[PDB]
Design a protein around this ligand. Structure first.
Ligand SMILES: C[C@@H]1[C@H]([C@H](C(=O)O)[C@@H](C)O)N=C(C(=O)O)[C@H]1S[C@@H]1CN[C@H](C(=O)N(C)C)C1
Ligand SMILES: C[C@@H]1[C@H]([C@H](C(=O)O)[C@@H](C)O)N=C(C(=O)O)[C@H]1S[C@@H]1CN[C@H](C(=O)N(C)C)C1
Ligand SMILES: C[C@@H]1[C@H]([C@H](C(=O)O)[C@@H](C)O)N=C(C(=O)O)[C@H]1S[C@@H]1CN[C@H](C(=O)N(C)C)C1
Ligand SMILES: C[C@@H]1[C@H]([C@H](C(=O)O)[C@@H](C)O)N=C(C(=O)O)[C@H]1S[C@@H]1CN[C@H](C(=O)N(C)C)C1
Ligand SMILES: [Zn+2]
Ligand SMILES: [Zn+2]
Ligand SMILES: [Zn+2]
Ligand SMILES: [Zn+2]
Ligand SMILES: [Zn+2]
Ligand SMILES: [Zn+2]
Ligand SMILES: [Zn+2]
Ligand SMILES: [Zn+2]
Lengths: 265, 265, 265, 265
């Protein structure tokens, strides 16, 4: 009996179902798929991309940027929620084709440079082309493009580098404080006494409190279902979206239930 | 219609068919699979590994090292023919589990650090966990472990970093100059006017001449079939093996035929 | 008037004054200089080095290891307090000459890979040869060599990656819990409203509390004066050494005074 | 007697003597110092910089770009002759402040990522802030910005990664084939039997022939004196400049004389 074949990272079809740009606020657009968020923020001096989704989405993102009037070279900066294959997948290829810089904290930088390999929980099961961060970000640091200020809020747990990004856009007239909060799932993770992540539970617990305190007129998440968006319904997409408070509290109830189950079995 | 799923790198079963250590000379053993070479050289001051095969072979290699009396921490150095998934696949994991250093030329180092992504010919189709080289090697440089001297001979073409490694072992008494020459295939490559590799044909042509001039009492290749080894027949494995001259000349005839076919269609 | 010349990183002579190995406990030795700590821990299966001091100390460290019976290849692992030139200076050269692996957290890893350049407070004024970390460590993770367990305790502030390392040695018979706590200085730092380190004050404040809670029968610090060691007096070197509590409290009083002075002027 | 202090990399004052932009052709300007070349090429879709000189020149270069109408964000690409402190010195800082990408061959990439440390001949004596290459270039590859095509010609010797860059500009009307050829010095190098560079002499010899064959209506070199430019005399700066043939032949005569002297003593 030979050694087993490598097994591809396959996802639900809706994670790979392309959509046209969906306007979130005056400068902010969802340009990823129906089930993976990729936010384009268009400024007077270039564009910012927050997340890119799966590795095979690079061309779709560039197509949607062009629909928005954004040439590849106009992308100045890539920001990330966390460096897993379904959110940072196409970053290497996007950098090559745009000249964009990547800004991320040290934890996200080292995982991205590994292509998601040697993941604390997934091992080498879910990888993607490696990419290097060009600017290292600290907790609370402000990154500014075209006058739009993006603030990082560290929320470790789902990954050590998990980050929420906040910025204030407008809706026609009035300001809208947008919060792009990272995932709070723990899919198949060993939570208690994890030798690769000894303070995992403490980090999640603090991250729930960080999410609750975010400036947050409008919450978005890497998976739209996590904050109750429906990208397929256009102008009704945000209607049932959760607050940052409700997102944190639902995530913590799920976490507490999984911890109790882990303690049981 | 959604975007396509990622597709795993699958190979012939014999590339993943484990074998027990096969002795090549007094200190040198084939410890990979029936169809992928991985050479262990055991010295008074630790072991050297030349190639590791596929990513999922790391545990098999460590098992065979232990059969040879070589504990994981006793592996001092990893050398590579070239940094493709089926030859350098398990290098990252081997480094983590042994403390070995990797020595390679600059071209092999940059490809390895990318996990084989953005390959000049394969793109992102065939990747593996990224790894960093700890020592950069120049053409003709000598690497010595436990008194055994390994000499690098650059033979670019199959990859820009393709390298032949030579060393002198013994067979009971008499010296045997071993040549571990890299692959000379060009699988699906565009050879002529390649914008990612403008001097590809010149490099292959020079590499044929480098292989012909190697010190070479015994030739081995990353794929045993390439030099006419049969690892499944034990002490008869090397009986029909090619000389370095015959390997180079057969590879150049194949190359010339493919170039003429490329020129035709 | 031409642009100014580059200016070397010069230190007090005692930071570069070599000393013979000074035994701290049964397996632990100070092998750096009179004014820079470099701890060698010798185990049944190889040695661990915690810090190396200045870049030009590599040969002195190897000389002292040899005096201890430790050949260069016997060094298995390098640990760091923080990645500044006077503590991590010779790490690159030590790795090349020993085959050791470096283990560090993500923050220390990214600063080390920059050679201390683009430092949040020093800019490019104080740099050293870059080095890569081979294993990324999480808060509370245990690294074990030869049965001796080293636990990391993150204490950000002096650098984002600042780390205390703890292990239990023996003194003849009885156990001694050693705490190698990092520096808590803020030399010339802007503490309040620092755009490169927005949560600097919160991190220092938490790090004082982390240091107070360390398992700590014997405290050592990267600069011996910081914990009131005198490496020049041999067996009396530790006599007046501070507890972890006193070190934290003295450091916090200094920090509070500097913050008040920063608030004033 | 203590260990010696670190010693700064100091150069002649004229290597740090700033100058205003000196026009070389319709799109090409010398914007470095009187004694260090840094070429700005201005295109319809952004600027290219070839070399930057010393680390402390970053601000001077940005000042000269602004004089040319080139904002920091308008710099798209940095190209290098070779990755030594006096030519690639400010690359890290320029990348941070412009968003430019660096393109270089694998040898130049690995040396740049080391900040020039562990240099084959200089060791750690001459270092600079490390920087990463964003695009790896092959021999003869064409890099295009704003329709202007830059071709790389490898000329190893001074460093393994030494590269000549060629492009065709215009002088008012007529085309001018510019050749920016790298240094061919061997300052204090051991040429014969160098274990860190065994094929050094063969590489230099081939590089003389590469330089002789360059498309070359106008030659420039990293040090203007090497090709007999005088940047201080404005429109007469290129009057006595050497051809590519004469540069190669003078460099080879110097090399041959140094080799004979090395063979003697
Ligand atoms: C298993 C996932 C997937 C993996 C991950 O990022 O952890 C990815 C590697 O495949 N992405 C994930 C994430 O939280 O970001 C996870 S969890 C899953 C995603 N949508 C679902 C959701 O959020 N609901 C509220 C139902 C659960
Ligand atoms: C297509 C391959 C495979 C790929 C490669 O390394 O290029 C790998 C990525 O899947 N390894 C390869 C190599 O030359 O190293 C190639 S060529 C193929 C391997 N054994 C065969 C062989 O060498 N014969 C003499 C029949 C041809
Ligand atoms: C300015 C330093 C020097 C610099 C640093 O590491 O920050 C280095 C870059 O030069 N190392 C330093 C450290 O805290 O680690 C600092 S502080 C200085 C060192 N010994 C002194 C001390 O600790 N006392 C209790 C008097 C103060
Ligand atoms: C010793 C140098 C200096 C060093 C180098 O790059 O090698 C640098 C590290 O300090 N740069 C150098 C180079 O060739 O690029 C060298 S050689 C020196 C520079 N101008 C002179 C010259 O080229 N003449 C024709 C007189 C000789
Ligand atoms: Zn995830
Ligand atoms: Zn996800
Ligand atoms: Zn291959
Ligand atoms: Zn192969
Ligand atoms: Zn410090
Ligand atoms: Zn210090
Ligand atoms: Zn040079
Ligand atoms: Zn120079």
């Amino acid at each position: 009996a030979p050694l087993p074949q490598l097994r591809a990272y396959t996802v639900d079809a809706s994670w790979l179902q392309p959509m046209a740009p969906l306007q979130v606020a005056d400068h902010t657009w969802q340009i990823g798929t129906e089930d993976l968020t990729a936010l384009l923020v268009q400024t007077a001096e270039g564009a910012v991309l927050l997340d890119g989704g799966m590795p095979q989405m690079a061309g779709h993102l560039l197509d949607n940027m062009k629909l928005r009037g954004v040439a590849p070279q106009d992308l100045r900066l890539i920001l990330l929620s966390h460096a897993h294959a379904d959110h940072a997948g196409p970053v290497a290829e996007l950098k090559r084709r745009t000249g964009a810089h990547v800004a991320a904290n040290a934890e996200t930088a080292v995982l991205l440079a590994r292509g998601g390999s040697n993941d604390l929980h997934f091992g080498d099961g879910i990888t993607y082309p490696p990419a290097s961060a060009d600017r290292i970000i600290m907790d609370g640091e402000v990154v500014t493009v075209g006058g739009i200020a993006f603030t990082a809020h560290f929320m470790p747990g789902h990954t050590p580098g998990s980050t929420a990004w906040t910025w204030t856009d407008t809706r026609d007239g009035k300001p809208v404080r947008i919060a792009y909060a990272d995932s709070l799932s723990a899919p198949g993770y060993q939570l208690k006494g994890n030798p690769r992540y000894p303070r995992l539970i403490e980090d999640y617990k603090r991250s729930f409190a960080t999410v609750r305190a975010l400036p947050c007129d409008l919450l978005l998440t890497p998976h739209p279902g996590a904050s109750n968006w429906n990208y397929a319904v256009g102008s009704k997409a945000s209607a049932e979206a959760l607050t940052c408070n409700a997102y944190a509290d639902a995530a913590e109830k799920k976490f507490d239930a999984q911890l109790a189950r882990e303690t049981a079995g």
